[PDB]
Amino acid sequence: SHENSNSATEGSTINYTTINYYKDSYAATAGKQSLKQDPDKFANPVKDIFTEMAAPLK
Amino acid sequence: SHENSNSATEGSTINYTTINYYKDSYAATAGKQSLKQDPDKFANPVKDIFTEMAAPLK
Amino acid sequence: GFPTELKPGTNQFLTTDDGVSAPILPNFHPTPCIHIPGEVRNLLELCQVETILEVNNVPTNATSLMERLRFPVSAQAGKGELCAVFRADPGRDGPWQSTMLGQLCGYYTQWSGSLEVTFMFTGSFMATGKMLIAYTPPGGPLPKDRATAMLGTHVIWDFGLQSSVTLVIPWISNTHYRAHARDGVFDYYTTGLVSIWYQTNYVVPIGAPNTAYIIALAAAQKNFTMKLCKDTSHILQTASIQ
Amino acid sequence: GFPTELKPGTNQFLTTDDGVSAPILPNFHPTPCIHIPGEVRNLLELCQVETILEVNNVPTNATSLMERLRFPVSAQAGKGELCAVFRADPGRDGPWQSTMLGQLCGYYTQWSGSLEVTFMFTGSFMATGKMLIAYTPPGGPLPKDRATAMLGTHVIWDFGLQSSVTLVIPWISNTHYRAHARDGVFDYYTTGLVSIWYQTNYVVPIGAPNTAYIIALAAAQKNFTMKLCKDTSHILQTASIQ
Amino acid sequence: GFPTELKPGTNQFLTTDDGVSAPILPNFHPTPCIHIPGEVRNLLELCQV
Amino acid sequence: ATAMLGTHVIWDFGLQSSVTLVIPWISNTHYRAHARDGVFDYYTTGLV
Amino acid sequence: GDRVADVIESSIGDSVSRALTQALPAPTGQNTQVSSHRLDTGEVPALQAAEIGASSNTSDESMIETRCVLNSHSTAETTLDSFFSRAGLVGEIDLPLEGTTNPNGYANWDIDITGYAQMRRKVELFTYMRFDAEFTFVACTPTGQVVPQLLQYMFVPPGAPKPESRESLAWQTATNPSVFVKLTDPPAQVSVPFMSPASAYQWFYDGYPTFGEHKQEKDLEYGACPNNMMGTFSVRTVGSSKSKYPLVVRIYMRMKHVRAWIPRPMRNQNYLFKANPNYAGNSIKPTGTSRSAITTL
Amino acid sequence: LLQYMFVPPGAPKPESRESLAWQTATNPSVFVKLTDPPAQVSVPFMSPA
Amino acid sequence: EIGASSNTSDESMIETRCVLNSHSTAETTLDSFFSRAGLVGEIDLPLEGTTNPNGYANWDIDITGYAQMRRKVELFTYMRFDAEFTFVACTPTGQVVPQ
Amino acid sequence: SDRVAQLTIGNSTITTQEAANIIVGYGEWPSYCSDDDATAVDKPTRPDVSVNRFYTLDTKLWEKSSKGWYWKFPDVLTETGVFGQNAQFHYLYRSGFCIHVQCNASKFHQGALLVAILPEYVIGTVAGGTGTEDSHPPYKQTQPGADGFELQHPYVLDAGIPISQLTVCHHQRINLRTNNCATIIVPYMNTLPFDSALNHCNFGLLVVPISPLDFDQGATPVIPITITLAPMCSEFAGLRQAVTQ
Ligand SMILES: CCCCCCCCCCCCC/C=C/[C@H](O)[C@H](N)CO
Ligand SMILES: CCCCCCCCCCCCC/C=C/[C@H](O)[C@H](N)CO
């Protein structure tokens, strides 16, 4: 399908599989997102990472 | 697609990618124009072209 | 004229139907995206942050609404007394309603995986003590003594240099997913109780104050999973906005 | 009978929907095209031509409407005086409204890139002078002295053999695109000011006239870009044509 | 605008028509199945008792 | 709030009980002499 | 080139975002390993410090005696596209016959999704969003009846002259996108791209858009972000004379290709105004519910 | 014109016709008239068991 | 006085920074400017009157009858285009009748 | 090896022996904008060591009946130093931050604090008590300056959002049993690469006492809280005259 590439995702690490019947890519369906998580961003945002086997403050 | 070639573009340097469901090519969609500009036609229409590093009238 | 045939489901408007729709702006390239920090890619990333659990939801008036975050401990007669108790349902009207897990599992019908409740002691440095934090699987009512509540899953917690313990509530369930429990027939999805008993006492020397406080912080594990997105239950709205 | 299902968006008429429609004339070959000079392929080609900027939009009556293209200079007391000032918004009611950039960015909502304002001196040959043409990024109000207005982006312009200078207005912006500014909340998209101060004076010998004139010509750069095509704002129409 | 033509049998509701219908819950994975004994695969298995 | 703008060191009390404010050699000359009242205030080092 | 040593060995101009995290693929939940009894010294996985700010990293195996479970619960439901792609009511436009609200057969609606409390509470979970849309306009009489009436929707971008009346010359839509529908058909459905000058929308913008001495008259411009004022939605009964059917238009927006940044707490109080986080001063209601004591249920 | 609404177990039921639970921000709803073919959805296996 | 415009780059006037510009110019082309349907004519068919009382009306083909479409197409002198006409018929009160 | 730390940046140094850890905001360090994200065409100035240094703002008084305070950033640094004189002359502005809140007590005092970073903390008022008037906060409450502002209803954070979910953003706790300082490194969080530094405040710092203070008669009765913060990777673009607001 030869179309324009101007959706609100372009330039990301997530690869879609959508259907589209027009020339512009913001009219396409939502599709199947890739399942990539990152718990280390909001839950463990510390500089030195400590092991769970050790007490942190010694 | 075997059809007639009688659109209002034929014989140009712009190559389209359109869809069409009839035998004549003026009923097709607008499509994706090629992006070719020419600023030297309306902005610098002079015979001898001068460099921007040099004053023109010396 | 291609042969076709309209089957039912025609001229309906399903609010959740994913399909191609008609774009209004042709050959339109949007504003390019820049690197903004804090990009979520899932809503299981907001489950694993600890938030304050309103265990002491006794006070009502607006001048003392800040007191509903911590519960007091003090010196007892040394009989193994009871400090606080609360249910472990994150889809019920109670202490779990004011977390990031109680508002993001208000938008879902079923949930799975292990909860965890991280406590924190905010007393003096020269004051120590031990607490028994027992978790009761369902069927068992409110225990009348610490000797009865010891039989469940419990964790003995000593105060000292480190001032936080983590009682992970295990996923003791017959079903793969459980829904939100409430009164009536929906007591089948009850998770249990969490009770806090004085193990020994709260010992304090001369000069340090009598009453200390504990702050409870609840989170989720790495095997937490939600399903069947719904509308939120524990909120209302007055009529005639503006 | 092929199985199908009509989804919503059916039996609508979108004015911008690109699609195949039914042709009325079969096997029709049109008139062949010949080489006509002046073929545009973009509307960014009409942005880069200079057009007269109505800086002196003081007069009103029809007998003096030709005076709104140039602004006068003369001999001062030599105190660093002010000649003219105007805003640098090409989507506002002002001097930029009568350019090729003010009518082709009336048909768009947002614009980007650098502007440039090319002046031209139409005085005598034996008369020289110097002007300071300062550009003020937004936030800064109208300056009260040339010592205050020197702190922005400015260009000192001497008169002589060459009689045109080009103050390119840099794209100093926080956003990638900016919209058309007007009064109220939309002052957030303001571009700034351009002021013209007497650097030294306007010196003239015996026999040559006192008052000269400067013509301002505005254009666009090679990084100009517009977006979000709209209806034009700075025009009206009376009712009952014919 | 693709050329088409509605043939009869249109806007009917046949109770036994097998066809694709519109799903209401997107990206929904159901509860996984476990080994429950006594799985029928035909109704000729209840004839022979 | 005025004295914070120079070179400063915030010092907490605890187990270790000594901090070291090294005064940097902020000077226009290679060597400086001994300052006193009058014209010889040119060789002043500053304040702590 | 460079000859000084405090620049050639410096770090001025570090442009790349030095990230401490690295996103790993996680299609299902995490399994559980077999753990036995452990009675050792020094190695404690149950004692942490909440003063650090990070959360608990206690596995289930390091606290109880576990069993091996091959977990196969999919996490494809809690993603952003499977949470926001559900169309909710964002606005309602009235067109009565004899009244004072809109008695001239047209009504202008400014584009904001913060008019109804059920959609507003979901999108204000985050601070920055970046989405497309699929609008849907369901038109009916106030008694639900469908009448044979023709209607014109018009999207007015910010700047274009609004129509003063029904017979005005701005309705000729030479460049504005317009939708012509009747009422005896399926409802209209368009697709709106990401139309912002910024790189993302923002529902909370702390600050003023103008400069100058902010006094008591100019205080209402606080929090009005002009990267979100997307224009004006306009409707009319397509004709010259007075119509005879009352109309009600309802707007349903669903987001697709959603990216969200910087989460924040969700609101617990009642909403009071549009684009204004005011609340009731006397009626501060707590989040949970109250009981008699803490020792009993 | 009619609106069907699927209320999952837990969500607040509408008290009346003008109630603010009909705004269906996350509930799947079907909007049909009566002058069309009847609505048809596809419900998955929605059980915890 | 030469007649050509300014060729002054931004780098030759101020001290610039390296910017990898990625703003697309696919919006200002001719197909993305004129492919928006505007009202070019209106035909009246009344019952009792003097304009068209015989149930028919003849309209000469010209797109210069309404001021909003006319100002766009008169930006150029010569044009060469196809068209997609669209005829929306209704009562003067907007009602749709079986006619 | 973990209790003690030192922060050296510019010509300033903070040494503390009862620290917990140095949190990093969203796993991203502050940096300079790349050529892809950049919008302007003028070269941005960047003073290296003259603005990336600690500014000790003000001393608060944590009494028994305290409620909380909030400081809007970067409003607090428009009158202090070369940073306060560059943000008055320049138009565009881009910087991370590094916030460090000291609060000390003995081993006989008890209490806790919540140090939070809330991006785009929009102040809302009480709408006249009953919720009828469309009131708006004044200029002396929205941008308070370097002196902060006392919270009137800290349970709803004076913005409608509850306090119990505040820890989804950046939070460290000053618990007077184990630690005495809370250090947060915040990157640049905005939808635009640059921003004006006179109207838009990026994030708001919130210091609220969760667990109250307590002591017996004989200890010293005043416990001060001091905020100390340092911009990091500051950049400015676009010169004009000095305007104050
Ligand atoms: C016929 C055209 C249909 C109208 C299409 C409108 C497109 C506008 C884009 C909608 C995206 C939501 C806009 C969000 C802004 C919020 O209201 C503000 N941040 C708060 O007032
Ligand atoms: C059922 C057939 C529908 C009618 C189709 C009409 C085809 C005519 C082609 C339209 C192209 C525009 C004609 C432009 C001419 C301008 O009015 C004149 N130059 C000025 O009067």
Numbering used by the authors:
A (entry chain D), B (entry chain D): 12 to 69
C (entry chain C), D (entry chain C): 1 to 242
E (entry chain C): 1 to 49
F (entry chain C): 147 to 194
G (entry chain A): 1 to 297
H (entry chain A): 150 to 198
I (entry chain A): 51 to 149
J (entry chain B): 10 to 254
Article, verbatim:
EV-A71 has been reported to bind to several cell surface receptors, including scavenger receptor B2 (SCARB2), P-selectin glycoprotein ligand-1 (PSGL1) and heparan sulfate (HS) glycosaminoglycan. Other host factors such as cyclophilin A, annexin II, sialylated glycans, vimentin, nucleolin, fibronectin and prohibitin have also been reported to promote infection, although their importance in viral entry is still less noted. It has been shown that EV-A71 interaction with PSGL1 on leukocytes requires the presence of sulfated tyrosine (Tyr) residues at the N-terminal region of PSGL1 and depends on two highly conserved lysine residues, VP1_244K and VP1_242K, near the 5-fold vertex of the viral capsid. Our data support a model of activity by which a single MADAL385 molecule binds on each of the 5-fold vertices of the EV-A71 capsid, thereby blocking the engagement of the virus with host receptors PSGL1 and/or HS.
The corresponding three-dimensional (3D) maps were reconstructed at 3.3 and 3.6 Å resolutions, respectively, by applying icosahedral-symmetry averaging and using the images from a Falcon-3 direct electron detector. The atomic models of free and drug-bound EV-A71_11316 superimpose with an overall RMSD value of 0.292 Å, indicating that the incubation with MADAL did not cause any significant conformational change on the viral capsid proteins. In the two atomic models, the pocket factor lipid (sphingosine) has slightly different conformations, but the corresponding cryo-EM densities have similar intensities, suggesting that the drug binding likely induces subtle conformational changes around the pocket region but does not initiate pocket factor release. When the two 3D reconstructions were compared, strong extra densities were identified on the 5-fold vertices of the EV-A71_11316-MADAL385 complex, indicating that MADAL385 binds on the 5-fold vertex. The drug density fills the pore on the 5-fold symmetry axis and is connected to the capsid density. In particular, the intensity of MADAL385 density was highest at the symmetry axis, suggesting that the bound drug molecule occupies the very centric area of the 5-fold vertex. Due to steric hindrance and electrostatic repulsion, these observations suggest that only one molecule of MADAL385 binds on each vertex. Two other residues, VP1_244K and 245Y, with their corresponding side-chains extended towards MADAL385, are also found within the density envelope at the interface between capsid and drug.
